[PDB]
């Protein structure tokens, strides 16, 4: 029976991961500072990565990638794209405003897309099927609009570019944050925010290292985390597409 601690008490997503983990009857939670744990749901900041992986007889797993902030802090991301050869790039705005966005009708309404991306300890890249545009439009709806209004689909007009941009950012920093041969292992959930322009071209805005979900999805996706990121490493007694 596995063990885990909780060190970000007010994180919507992992509050639901802890809760579902107990309910399996195969995990118990310890106290923040007890080192004899299998799994750390860690702080957002100053997470002590240098103390993980030094407990004999404990495989240890943490829900953050040391170094991922290179992608999630705006100033760093920009330096990253401008400087990393693997990025040159054509999908990131000139950086040091998108004056012609796509508008939903009726309303002449602007929007941005949030996609949810899980990277496990093997560095597989899992895109959650459900994205989001309460001023919230989901994927089944948005697809039908595009077909009716533009005669195209969500996959072909937007998602190809999205899966391409996710692949490219995360394969860029892969050799810097990968835990393949480390003494502890990392997974992490990301939130990518895109905008679409009239030409049906996708752009990247920001990458969020500690994203919240959308209410009606806080359940399918939290279960998908235990299945792919946790129980994959701590077995017990698809909703993602792999990129």
């Amino acid at each position: 029976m596995y063990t885990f601690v909780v060190r970000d008490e007010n994180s919507s997503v992992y509050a639901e991961v802890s809760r579902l983990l107990l309910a399996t009857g195969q995990w118990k939670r310890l106290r923040k500072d007890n080192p004899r744990f299998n799994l750390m749901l860690g702080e957002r900041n100053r997470l002590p990565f240098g103390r993980l992986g030094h407990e004999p007889g404990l495989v240890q797993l943490v829900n953050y990638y040391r170094g991922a902030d290179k992608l999630c802090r705006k100033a760093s991301l920009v330096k990253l794209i401008k400087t990393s050869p693997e990025l040159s790039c054509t999908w990131f705005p000139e950086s040091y405003y998108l004056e012609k966005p796509l508008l939903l009708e009726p309303g002449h309404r602007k929007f941005d897309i949030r996609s949810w991306v899980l990277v496990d300890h093997l560095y597989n890249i899992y895109l959650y099927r459900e994205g989001v545009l309460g001023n919230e439009m989901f994927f089944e709806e948005f697809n039908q609009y595009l077909m009716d209004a533009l005669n195209t689909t969500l996959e072909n007009s937007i998602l190809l570019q999205i899966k391409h941009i996710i692949r490219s950012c995360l394969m860029c920093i892969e050799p810097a944050i990968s835990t393949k041969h480390l003494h502890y292992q990392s997974f992490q959930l990301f939130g990518f925010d895109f905008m679409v322009d009239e030409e049906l071209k996708v752009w990247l805005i920001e990458v969020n290292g500690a994203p919240a979900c959308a209410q009606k999805l806080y359940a399918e996706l939290c279960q998908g985390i235990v299945d792919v990121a946790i129980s994959s490493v701590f077995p017990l007694a698809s909703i993602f597409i792999k990129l």
Partner: peptide, 14 residues
């Protein structure tokens, strides 16, 4: 450049 070969475990990438 593999941590599993160092006299001290630690991550020189960071």
């Amino acid at each position: 450049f593999e941590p599993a070969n160092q006299m001290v475990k630690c991550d020189p990438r960071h």
